């Protein structure tokens, strides 16, 4: 449940479907810490 | 496009503990593309 | 070889080909991440 | 070599390091029905 | 049991652990993809 | 964060047939942020 990197980007791919996504704090959220899946869709757009 | 190894890593990702089962996920999510939801449908 | 989480998810995958495999949590996390199974088990898990 | 969902995804994430990059729903159409090269891809990253 | 392109690669970085491994393309690519090759002849591509 | 599976999905792509070897390529790409320049020094 740790999220980073390519990892990340791929988790976001997954998650966002058709609304895509910006990836360069969901680093905080979701990889210093445990982010839930609907914590991750919040990051779409 | 969610495909190999790929598309296993995901079901790993969205179903946790849970589990899943993997064969059609790959007509339904590689070969088109499916949701969340409709992979999560492939947990247990 | 303590194979877990997604490494374990990556094995199957791998030796199954298209027999496909199963993965739930006596019991594979028991048999191949807390201790080093051979593919024998793992093969075992495809269907 | 035919960079589509996923896969498209792992690249653009390598080629782009710090920049970041974008992704939408034509970068399916150059990269992933047809093989394109680096900068074609890169124009899609920041 | 046909390891082809970054299956191939995958089942390399499987099987290999911590020893790594070469991938070069008579042929880790005959022999594993054209052909059904086992672990030792994929192992003697670990390092 | 370029790491393990995926670090070595990442060589094989840009290596293509020049191949590549695999073992610090670690700390450079995955405890680190890696450029294709200092990937590329993994292929052959």
Redesign the interface.
Same mark, same amino acid.
């Given at each position: 449940?740790h999220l %980073?990197?390519?990892?990340? @980007?791929?988790?976001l791919?997954? @998650?966002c *479907?058709?609304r *895509? &996504? &910006?990836?360069?704090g969901i680093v905080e959220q979701c %990889?210093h810490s445990i982010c839930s899946?609907e914590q991750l869709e919040n990051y779409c757009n």
């Open positions: 449940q %980073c990197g390519s990892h990340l @980007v791929e988790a791919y997954l @998650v *479907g058709e *895509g &996504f &910006f990836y360069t %990889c899946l």
